Design a protein around this ligand. Structure first.
Ligand SMILES: OC[C@H]1O[C@H](O[C@H]2[C@H](O)[C@@H](O)[C@H](OCCCCCCC3CCCCC3)O[C@@H]2CO)[C@H](O)[C@@H](O)[C@@H]1O
Length: 265
């Protein structure tokens, strides 16, 4: 593979799209590779990790319980609800809703959770409160995936998202149990995790959440590292490309491959 920045540039040229990327040491927050790290990209389903961080903050405060059941109606469901549509009769616990949102990308689960934190405005307030002054959620599922050209709504930047993920996972803002839960949900991703594992060299840790949206929007937030260790946060977003989903996937994979082949800093 080319060197990481070389590969990232090639991905833009080939997709005729914008790529944004950061690679960050998990333990220290040291920024390692960066590209358009201060530019705005749709979060899409990657927002669900931040959402469940806010939910866990409420649990830690005793204002929420992972075991609390939420009940809802078929008329509440939005597009793509593989787990939540199965529980119209019995409801789902808050913990199961976060598991469905993160591990299956369930959109109605995410909306039910989003309401518990005060909606898009509440989640944005939580972000400001942890010192992310950039990331913003404005819409619910599935409008938050619209990726309107030039729109600031429902965006993050690679740098802000990486810093925020690090805060949630390691800063002790969340309790020990909550930090561990948020990572385990990402470890358990069923959408992309198994596929990624199947193609990663032996010895590499992976945890992830992916997203997809309109106008080619695509992304991944991940923890990655050799020696079976979660060493670095890698955030990669794509926007404004007409390319097939297959090609967007392949380009993100190519950027990942370049980072892995050229890991030593
Ligand atoms: O610009 C597109 C690139 O497409 C390929 O990339 C290949 C790569 O050579 C191979 O090594 C990998 O297989 C392994 C996939 C690695 C996945 C890494 C997972 C990452 C994803 C991002 C977050 C952290 C984990 O596939 C991709 C896509 O076909 C080739 O390198 C080359 O044609 C071109 O430079």
């Amino acid at each position: 593979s080319p060197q990481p920045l070389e590969q990232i540039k090639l991905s833009e040229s080939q997709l005729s799209g914008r790529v944004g990327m950061i690679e960050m040491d998990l333990a220290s927050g040291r920024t390692l590779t960066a590209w358009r790290a201060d530019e705005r990209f749709p979060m899409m389903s990657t927002f669900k990790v931040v959402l469940c961080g806010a939910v866990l903050a409420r649990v830690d405060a005793g204002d929420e319980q992972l075991e609390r059941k939420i009940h809802y109606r078929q008329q509440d469901l939005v597009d793509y609800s593989p787990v939540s549509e199965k529980h119209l009769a019995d409801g789902m616990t808050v913990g199961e809703l976060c598991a469905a949102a993160i591990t299956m990308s369930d959109n109605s689960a995410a909306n039910l959770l989003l309401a518990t934190v005060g909606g898009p405005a509440g989640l944005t307030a939580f972000l400001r409160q942890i010192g992310d002054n950039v990331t913003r959620l404005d819409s619910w599922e599935t409008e938050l995936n619209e990726a309107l050209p030039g729109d600031a709504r429902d965006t993050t930047t690679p740098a802000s998202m990486a810093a925020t993920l690090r805060k949630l996972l390691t800063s002790q803002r969340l309790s020990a149990r909550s930090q561990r839960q948020l990572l385990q949900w990402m470890v358990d991703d069923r959408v992309a995790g198994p596929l990624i594992r199947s193609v990663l060299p032996a010895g590499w840790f992976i945890a992830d959440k992916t997203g997809a949206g309109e106008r080619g929007a695509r992304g991944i937030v991940a923890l990655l590292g050799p020696n079976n260790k979660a060493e670095r946060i890698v955030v990669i977003y794509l926007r404004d490309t007409p390319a097939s989903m297959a090609e967007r996937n392949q380009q993100i994979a190519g950027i990942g491959a370049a980072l892995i082949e050229h890991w030593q800093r």
